[PDB]
């Protein structure tokens, strides 16, 4: 028989007004949510977490994704094409690099308890609208500032690193925005 399955309807906006006297980003992150232009470029399935990973290892596994992705899959503005064909991802520390989802326009949407990406491809909304279910985010202004990444609980895998192309500044922007947005209720007891 067939008794229940999945109802595919993702709709749940957070509405709460203590005030609206915020600044441009804050207004949205607390209300609708700020939006940045990003490009889905590859995805790496990581079966591990920061809790479980080494200080360099977690940076390596994240950069790995961004690395072999940008140096192999389409979208990257700078590649020399170097992929280890039949080998391990980095040290088989995580799952594996899956260069399948590359070349899809999306939108980094930051929200109080949500961090989802809207497919500008007019497909739908991806990622998860749940702050408590994220993990990594590579960005800021490093070597990799030209290619951004975020690792969260994946709709397919347990966790996945999703690399964003064409940041235009989204790197440091989303990092600062998401961080400081959540920081509005950030306790000093942890992190």
């Amino acid at each position: 028989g067939q008794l229940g399955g999945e109802e595919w309807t993702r709709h749940g906006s957070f509405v709460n007004k203590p005030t609206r006297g915020w600044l441009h980003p804050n207004d949205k992150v607390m209300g609708p949510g700020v939006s940045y232009l990003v490009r889905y470029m590859g995805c790496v399935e990581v079966l591990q977490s920061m809790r479980a990973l080494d200080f360099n290892t977690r940076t390596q596994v994240t950069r790995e994704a961004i690395s072999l992705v940008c140096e192999a899959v389409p979208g990257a503005k700078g590649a020399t094409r170097r992929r280890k064909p039949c080998s391990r991802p980095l040290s088989s520390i995580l799952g594996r690099s899956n260069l399948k989802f590359a070349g899809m326009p999306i939108t980094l949407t930051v929200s109080t308890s949500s961090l989802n990406l809207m497919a500008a491809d007019c497909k739908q909304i991806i990622a998860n609208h749940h702050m408590q279910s994220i993990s990594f985010a590579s960005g800021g202004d490093p070597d990799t500032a030209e290619y951004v990444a975020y690792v969260a609980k994946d709709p397919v895998n347990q966790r996945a690193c999703h690399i964003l192309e064409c940041p235009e500044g989204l790197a440091q922007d989303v990092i600062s925005t998401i961080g400081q947005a959540f920081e509005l209720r950030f306790k000093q007891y942890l992190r």
């Binding site: 920061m50 994240t62 994220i134 990799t144």
Partner: peptide, 27 residues
């Protein structure tokens, strides 16, 4: 053992800043 990384080559080496906040792991 003390190298620096677990392994490195054209595909894979650490080089970037990846983190978020206190959601999954207080690091």
């Amino acid at each position: 053992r003390a190298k620096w990384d677990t392994a490195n080559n054209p595909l894979y080496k650490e080089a970037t800043s990846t983190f978020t906040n206190i959601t999954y792991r207080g690091t």
